[PDB]
Design a protein around this ligand. Structure first.
Ligand SMILES: CC(=O)N[C@@H]1[C@@H](O)[C@H](O[C@@H]2O[C@H](CO)[C@@H](O[C@@H]3O[C@H](CO)[C@@H](O[C@@H]4O[C@H](CO)[C@@H](O)[C@H](O)[C@H]4NC(C)=O)[C@H](O)[C@H]3NC(C)=O)[C@H](O)[C@H]2NC(C)=O)[C@@H](CO)O[C@H]1O
Length: 327
């Protein structure tokens, strides 16, 4: 079903100046389309979604079309202007029910967790294998419940910011490391994770060195932490285990403007990072990969976004599709 080298692209269910792309006009180079976004109202727990164009039937039909072409269409929950709060079981149930309703209604292939607020590790929540914070416990539970409610081809992805994942190397509390229990809690159902390697400033690798976003070294350092695992919160006895290589992707801006706070990397530089991550071929960078000979099963690239890509001469899709096809 799903290929071993993927391009996952976010699709704007809204017009932010880059315009609307009808689903059938989405470049075939994208293997997975993350429809953005499912959003909540007053109760911050019931997720709603209405297509930006066409009737509900029309939209479902376009999705069915994409699916017939081998593409996956995923519902992304978030993001910048999305918020899900599950303080208790009642909220969790509204969340589960609303999501399942949407999946059925439109025929989504799965869900993408793209929540960048309302997620914190409470005081005393110190063990990523056994979280205690309601938001986190309930999210894990809801995700597992939803996943179990659908067949083997259900797709589960997530796009946390680096502080929530790799940031766990520095601290475990508040937002720092906060997605680690989520990842660990659903690892057996996780298709892949694509951390947002952008609007991130700098990041500390497993070598204790600081790297700047938008550089080949940074891309390798951040991905390697998921490919290899790493000690959490300065505790050598608290190691976050490696994910399967096929569960690891990297999230990138399709264009400089797609990440106004920085993060964009030129395909030329990114290919150096990819060749190092995948084939173990160095490029003279400062960061030394955990595995000398690479992680060939590395899953691919995610991008914000399909709409930005189309506005930027299809630079992202053309460059990386050709790269991965060439493997
Ligand atoms: C806790 C936390 O959120 N961390 C800080 C961020 O808040 C802060 O700014 C936010 O950065 C994130 C990316 O890390 C960003 O969300 C992602 O980035 C793109 C833009 O680069 C977002 O695209 C926007 O989506 C909304 C709809 O949700 C559109 O209305 C808007 O037009 C889009 N903008 C553009 C340029 O296209 C995406 O939502 C999301 N990317 C993905 C893959 O989902 C937030 O937008 C940022 N929020 C703010 C405050 O602007 C970050 C940098 O300041 O620093 C973190 O520490």
């Amino acid at each position: 079903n799903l290929g071993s080298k993927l391009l996952v692209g976010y699709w704007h269910n809204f017009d932010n100046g880059t315009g609307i792309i009808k689903l059938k006009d989405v470049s075939p180079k994208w293997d997975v389309i993350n429809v953005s976004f499912g959003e909540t109202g007053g109760d911050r727990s019931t997720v709603e979604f209405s297509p930006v164009y066409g009737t509900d039937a029309d939209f479902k039909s376009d999705i069915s079309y994409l699916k017939s072409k081998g593409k996956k269409v995923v519902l992304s929950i978030g993001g910048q202007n999305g918020v899900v709060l599950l303080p208790d079981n009642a909220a969790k149930d509204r969340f589960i029910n609303s999501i399942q309703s949407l999946i059925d209604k439109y025929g989504f292939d799965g869900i993408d967790i793209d929540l960048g607020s309302g997620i914190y590790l409470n005081g005393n929540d110190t063990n990523f294998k056994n979280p205690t914070t309601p938001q986190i416990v309930n999210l894990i539970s809801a995700i597992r419940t939803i996943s179990d409610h659908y067949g083997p081809d259900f797709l589960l992805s997530m796009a946390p910011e680096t502080a929530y994942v790799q940031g766990g190397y520095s601290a475990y509390g508040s937002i720092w490391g906060a997605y680690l229990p989520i990842i660990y809690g659903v690892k057996d159902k996780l298709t892949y994770i694509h951390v947002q390697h952008f609007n991130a400033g700098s990041g500390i690798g497993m070598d204790g060195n600081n790297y700047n976003q938008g550089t080949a070294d940074y891309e390798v350092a951040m991905a390697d932490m998921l490919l290899h695992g790493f000690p959490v919160g300065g505790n050598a006895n608290n190691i976050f285990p490696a994910l399967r290589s096929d569960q690891v992707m990297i999230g990138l801006p399709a264009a400089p403007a797609a990440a106004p706070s920085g993060g964009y990397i030129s395909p030329t530089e990114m290919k150096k990072a990819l060749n190092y991550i995948i084939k173990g071929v160095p490029f003279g960078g400062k960061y030394k990969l955990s595995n000398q000979s690479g992680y060939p099963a590395f899953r691919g690239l995610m991008s914000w976004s399909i709409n930005w890509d189309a506005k930027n001469n299809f630079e992202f899709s053309n460059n990386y599709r050709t790269y991965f096809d060439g493997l």
